[PDB]
Structures are given as C-alpha cells and as structure tokens.
C-alpha cells in the first residue's frame with residue numbers, strides 16, 4: 001500500500017487513488033482506514049495517536065528500494081479508478097492499483 | 113455449530129484483560145469489596161459482591177444497603193445492578209471497548 | 225415518482241411468531257391478513273388476547289419504511305434519570321444517522337436533523353422490572369436496504385456510549401423481512417406484558433413503520449450505490 | 456510506637472495470589488511465612504521465580520505502617536517525561552497529606568511537610584507496555600485507619616489535578632489486609648516483569664511499608680476519633696466552585712426573576728423549590744405558566760434542574776461546574792476583561 | 793466413535809470457588825487436583841471441612857456430560873406435597889428436553905422421555 005518514489009517522496013493508496021503529500025503524511029490516515037481488516041485484538045492498539053505515530057515510524061524504516069511510476073502508456077487514470085484502453089474495460093479498487101499512476105483527470109468515472 | 117447458534121461469547125477477543133476490567137469496577141465502588149477473592153473469569157456474573165459500607169455508597173448516595181450487588185455482562189459492558197428491591201440503587205455501566213477520547217472525536221465529527 | 229409511491233395505507237400483519245415461508249407466500253387468511261388503520265383497531269378490540277407481528281408485505285415492490293429502533297434495558301430507571309437518558313439518546317441517535325445519510329447517501333445533514341428531533345413517537349412497556357419501548361421517527365423515510373447498510377454504524381454507536389438506553393439498542397432487528405410487534409398485543413398466549421401508547425399521540429397510525437404518508441415536512445434519502453458493489 | 460512496641464519489622468509474606476482466608480488464620484506454612492530482613496533476601500536468591508506479597512501481621516495488634524502509594528503511568532500521552540513529573544508529583548501529594556494531617560489529625564503542618572519531602576524511596580516496573588511504580592516515604596508513620604479515611608481526599612485530588620501521575624493514583628490499595636508486592640519478584644509464575652530498584656537506595660529494609668524503625672528524626676500522627684464515627688461532607692463538594700458562582704449561572708438560564716433567590720444557601724438548595732413567576736414564556740418549555748415550581752438536585756457533579764408534579768411536561772436542563780482547577784483560572788482571567 | 797467419547801472416569805474438583813486463571817492452567821495442587829472415584833471418597837473423609845467444586849477439566853476435548861438441574865425454593869414445603877410435586881416436575885422437565893430434541897436435535901422423542 002505504501003511506496004517510495006525516485007524523488008524521495010512517499011505515495012500512499014487511499015480512496016482508490018495514488019495520492020501523495022509532501023507536507024501532510026497520509027500514512028496515519030491509511031492506518032486508521034485499514035484498521036477494520038485486522039483481528040479484533042489488533043484494532044484496540046490503533047486508537048492512541050502515539051501508537052499510530054509509532055507504527056508510521058516503524059513503516060518508514062522498511063522502504064529501502066525505490067520504485068518508478070507511470071510505466072504503462074495505455075491506461076487513462078480517473079479519480080475512482082483506471083480505465084483500460086486495450087479492451088475498454090474499467091477497473092477500480094485493488095485492480096486499478098498495480099499500475100502506479102500518479103496524475104489523474106480530476107473527476108470521478110460514472111459508467112451509467 | 114456455535115456459528116449458526118449465536119455469534120456471542122462471554123469474553124470475546126478485543127476485550128481488555130479480566131484483571132483490568134475488574135480494576136475499573138473496583139474504582140467505581142469507592143469502598144472495599146469484602147469477597148474479592150471469589151471472582152474470576154468464569155463466575156463473576158453469579159457471585160454476589162458484599163460491599164462494606166464505611167462511606168456512603170458511591171452509586172445511590174445512601175448510608176448503607178440491605179443486599180449485595182451483582183455484576184452482569186451485556187453488549188460488551190459490565191452492568192452493575194442491585195438485587196432485592198431494584199429501585200433502591202441506580203444503574204451504572206462499565207465500558208470496556210477501548211479509548212474514550214477516540215469516542216469523543218467520533219461524536220464531535222458526527223455532528224458535522 | 226407516481227402516486228402509489230407517495231403513499232401506503234395498507235398494513236400487512238402476522239398472527240404467530242415463526243410462520244413458515246410456504247404459508248407466507250400463499251397468504252392464507254389463517255396466518256396472514258391485510259388491514260387498514262380503522263380495521264386494525266376493531267380486530268384488537270374484538271380479540272383482547274390475540275398476537276400480531278407487523279412486517280413488510282413485499283420487499284422489492286415497496287422498501288419505503290420509517291426509521292424505527294428497539295430498546296430493552298433489564299433494569300428499572302427512575303423518572304428524572306429516564307428523562308435525562310432520553311435526551312442524550314435522541315441527540316446521539318439523530319446525529320449519527322444524519323452523518324451516515326450525508327456521507328454515503330448524498331443527503332443534506334441539517335434537513336435530517338430537523339425532521340427527526342421535531343416529531344417522534346414513543347411507546348412504553350407495561351412491565352415494571354425492565355424498561356423497553358419502540359421509538360419510531362415519524363418524519364424520516366428511507367428504504368429498508370438503507371437500514372441494513374446502517375446496521376454496522378449503529379452497532380458501533382451502541383457499543384461506544386455510557387447512556388444505558390443507547391447501549392441497549394437492539395441492532396439484530398435490522399435484517400431482511402423483519403418483524404415488529406404491534407402496540408397493544410402480547411408476544412405469546414402465555415405472556416401478560418403489552419405495550420401502551422404515550423401522549424400526545426393517540427392515533428394508532430403513528431406506531432406502524434410500514435405506514436407511508438409523505439407530507440410537507442417529511443424527508444427522503446437512500447443509497448446511490450447498491451448492496452453488491454459494497455464488498 | 457516509640458521503640459518499645461516496634462514489633463512491626465517482621466515481614467508477612469503471602470506466596471500465592473488470592474490466598475483463601477480460611478488458611479491465613481491457621482498460618483499454613485504452604486501459604487504464609489515469617490521472615491526477617493536478612494532471611495528474606497536469601498529466600499529471594501534461592502528461588503528465582505518465587506512470588507512474595509508483603510502484608511500486615513494483624514490489624515488490631517500492629518496497625519502502624521509507612522505511608523505508601525501506587526501510581527500507574529499509562530494512557531497514550533507522548534509527553535511521558537519522568538523527572539519533572541515525579542518531583543512535581545511529590546509536591547501536591549505532600550501538600551494534601553499535610554493538609555489532611557492539620558485538619559483531621561492535629562499534627563503540625565510544617566513538621567509533616569518537612570519529614571515527607573526529606574527522604575523517600577522509589578521503584579519502577581520494567582514493563583514498557585504500561586509503567587507502574589510504587590513510592591514510599593520513609594519518615595512518615597501512621598495507622599492504617601487514617602489511610603482508609605483519607606481515601607476520599609486522595610480520590611478528589613486525582614480528579615482535578617494537573618500531572619498524569621497524580622491523575623492516575625491508585626487509591627484501591629487502602630483496604631483491610633492490604634497486599635503490596637515485594638520489590639524484585641514476579642506477579643504470576645508466567646509474567647517475567649518485576650519491580651527493579653532505583654538508585655541510590657539498595658537495601659530491602661527501605662522498600663517495605665511494614666518495616667518500621669522510628670529514629671530521632673521521624674514524625675508520627677493518627678486519627679483521634681474512631682473509624683465508625685465519620686460524618687459525610689455537606690451537599691456541596693468542596694473542590695469545584697464557590698457557591699455564589701453556581702447560582703448566578705442558574706439564574707442566567709432562567710430569563711424570569713427568582714422571587715426566593717435570597718433563601719438559598721450552601722445546604723438548603725437541594726430542598727427549596729424555586730417558585731418563579733413567568734412574565735415571559737418559560738426558557739425551558741416555552742410555555743405560558745406552570746402548575747408547580749422548579750427544584751435543584753446535585754448528582755455526579757452537576758445541578759439537575761427539573762419540575763415536580765408532572766416532570767414530563769417540562770424539559771430537563773443540566774448545569775455543569777467544570778471541576779478543573781486551571782480552567783477556573785482562565786475563566787476568571789477572561790472575566791476581568 | 794472412540795473410547796474417549798465412550799468413556800470418562802476422571803474427576804476434576806476445585807478447592808475454592810473462583811480459582812485464578814493463572815493457577816488453573818498450571819494445575820497447582822494448592823488450588824486444584826484430579827481425583828478418581830475411590831480416592832475422592834478418601835479425601836472428603838480425610839478432611840473434615842474441605843470445600844470442593846466439580847468442573848470440566850478440558851472443555852474443547854471432552855464436552856460430553858450428563859443432564860443436571862438445580863432447584864432453590866426458599867419456602868418450607870411439606871413432605872406429602874413434596875412427593876406429589878417431584879413427579880409432576882419430572883413429568884414437566886422431561887417434556888421440555890424431549891420437545892426440543894425432536895424439534896432441533898433430531899433425537900427420538902419417545903426414546904428421550
């Protein structure tokens with residue numbers, strides 16, 4: 001979910017978008033959003049702000065190798081997913097995540 | 113099996129340790145419990161607590177009580193009620209879910 | 225948005241808990257019947273011992289139901305604390321539903337708050353040992369699918385409070401094709417406890433959550449997404 | 456006390472947690488054992504995982520104990536700074552105990568305050584998950600009964616204090632036949648966290664609240680009356696707000712005028728109905744008039760304003776009294792404009 | 793179906809109501825003890841004022857137990873009315889277990905009674 005870019009910034013994955021901020025780290029937001037997908041005995045430790053800061057600090061010391069972004073030249077990224085161009089299908093969530101798309105059109109995609 | 117019977121137990125994971133839960137209960141009764149050594153994780157809902165009334169009861173503000181109190185577990189909270197005449201003493205509830213300030217933040221964000 | 229969807233004056237009731245599904249679809253008079261507001265009163269008067277279980281007639285045709293909750297606290301509460309408890313109960317409940325109606329339902333927050341705290345109908349059990357009631361918000365209309373989705377956040381609220389009334393919220397009633405006991409009837413032929421109305425509401429039209437009557441002060445909201453994309 | 460009747464130097468040690476009371480009186484060697492300072496040390500060394508729980512021999516025999524206290528440094532605060540907390544902690548704790556001594560014990564305030572701030576001992580739990588350490592002042596001796604009476608005063612301090620340490624005081628340890636874990640031993644045969652000593656004190660005879668050795672530079676005091684004579688405080692709970700500030704807030708809510716404002720004092724405000732006339736519609740129910748007047752009631756630290764007769768006819772308003780100490784300071788500073 | 797579910801002749805008794813959780817697992821002889829039927833009779837006779845409490849030793853392993861009921865009537869009742877009350881109580885309770893067994897457990901209703 002968290003990745004390191006070549007320029008030294010950290011990109012996170014929330015709201016189905018590879019958003020990133022150099023001034024406001026969204027790692028704590030991601031932790032508090034993902035707290036629902038853990039066993040019941042692990043959730044209670046994700047409430048103290050001190051504990052979330054500790055988790056963020058522990059995460060920051062594990063990203064060693066850089067990752068390059070925007071490698072796929074036939075994908076159009078929207079705000080709520082990436083629309084493929086080979087067959088016209090549109091992905092969202094975890095599907096439109098392996099393609100590390102940074103920029104976006106700025107508006108949501110409505111299939112109707 | 114139990115999965116189709118009820119998704120409920122007497123102490124589910126995620127709850128605090130039993131000793132901590134009793135410690136919270138012990139601080140509500142300002143006086144000292146006499147038969148404290150009769151409590152464990154398996155009979156605390158049946159053993160009546162015989163409080164010693166040196167100071168007025170912290171719950172009903174009365175000088176003394178006729179009958180011992182008794183714990184009960186409902187919806188993840190140890191309700192404290194008095195046996196005998198139920199209207200003599202009011203009702204106090206001991207939460208055991210998690211952080212309180214997190215609840216404050218949730219309920220302040222709730223009002224929009 | 226035709227005429228028939230802005231009104232529902234037909235009541236579908238049961239007569240015994242645990243009616244098998246086969247009897248329900250066949251709609252045999254022996255177990256299920258249709259009723260009106262006036263006819264329901266006559267039936268209760270003529271049968272001072274009968275048992276009825278209000279429920280939805282058809283799901284996919286009409287999901288429009290009022291907002292209702294159930295409370296069951298196994299402890300008596302004195303009058304002054306009961307009043308104080310019900311003030312905090314409404315403030316927390318009205319806010320929590322309004323937040324959900326604004327974040328995942330695309331509705332306006334303040335309209336929901338005003339429509340709930342203004343006119344609400346409260347019942348009262350005849351039992352003395354425990355305090356139970358059925359709070360039905362009179363001017364808040366939504367689909368049953370919304371209540372099913374709302375079940376999670378309501379459960380979190382009930383487990384995260386200190387007020388005894390809001391902590392004893394029955395969150396298990398919110399399911400598919402639910403049943404709510406009508407006021408003035410027993411639960412089984414062996415029980416002796418019934419629910420009684422409260423002032424200022426006297427008409428029985430204010431205690432059936434299937435009665436839909438969209439007036440000038442009512443509000444409507446529901447999900448834009450469906451229950452299959454919400455994995 | 457003096458020295459002639461200083462038998463309170465032995466150590467009653469309990470082996471298991473939750474020892475049945477039917478065996479303590481019989482003094483079963485499998486549960487209890489008498490020891491001295493030197494023998495206790497050797498018994499600790501030869502058994503590495505032994506658990507010992509220090510306790511009193513008999514209440515009616517030797518009730519004099521050291522003033523001992525427990526603090527559980529916990530919660531999620533990032534400012535966990537140790538030294539300034541402990542030194543500040545020993546200040547307010549010192550004041551209230553001396554203040555209680557001069558009120559209900561007839562002891563010199565400066566003599567008590569000098570002895571307790573002079574010398575003290577301190578331990579520490581190595582468990583990083585939550586910190587919990589005992590504090591034992593050495594040169595303050597008193598009976599156990601006054602500690603039970605002081606329980607209410609200590610709890611009130613914890614609610615309206617500044618430091619997290621004094622906010623999380625554990626007053627439940629003051630009871631009949633209290634048990635304090637000896638330094639350097641486990642709690643249960645499974646957990647490995649033990650209480651480690653702190654410098655410069657090292658010997659064990661200063662880490663026990665039963666080992667009493669009154670030298671010439673010590674102070675002693677106790678209760679004068681008997682324990683079964685305490686009278687509770689008045690309806691007001693000295694610790695929050697002066698009486699006149701509470702009523703003016705109450706009068707602020709009522710738009711009308713209190714005809715019987717004057718007859719309310721620090722003791723009759725919970726029984727005198729507030730007979731108010733309604734020149735304007737009632738500030739609570741927005742109604743013309745009412746059949747019965749309003750009353751006051753103090754529960755949990757608030758004033759519940761309601762009306763008798765048919766309480767469901769009028770809504771219930773709650774008046775708070777904050778309860779903090781520095782917030783009153785801020786309110787007063789902003790008052791002066 | 794094996795011997796373990798066809799046989800259980802070990803008895804686990806307590807020594808004080810409310811044993812600590814940290815001591816029951818380690819099976820400290822000062823709080824708990826496992827006994828056989830013959831040795832149990834000797835122990836209760838050995839100690840004039842012992843206090844035992846029977847319990848299940850391992851729940852998830854051997855969950856098979858008999859049927860038991862407890863009655864606590866705080867009112868003096870004469871022997872003749874005691875005799876006539878006990879059978880109708882037995883008649884009633886046997887109907888309760890049999891009714892559920894045929895409804896939810898699938899047991900033979902007449903064989904239950």
Ligand SMILES: Nc1ncnc2c1ncn2[C@@H]1O[C@H](COP(=O)(O)OP(=O)(O)OP(=O)(O)O)[C@@H](O)[C@H]1O
Pocket residue numbers: 131138144145148149472473525587627630635636642
């Ligand atoms: N109300 C009470 N009545 C009787 N015993 C009590 C009561 N409250 C606490 N105790 C006893 O006090 C002991 C304190 O154990 P606890 O888990 O708090 O240890 P701790 O945090 O390491 O600190 P310490 O043992 O020094 O208090 C409990 O194990 C129990 O035996």
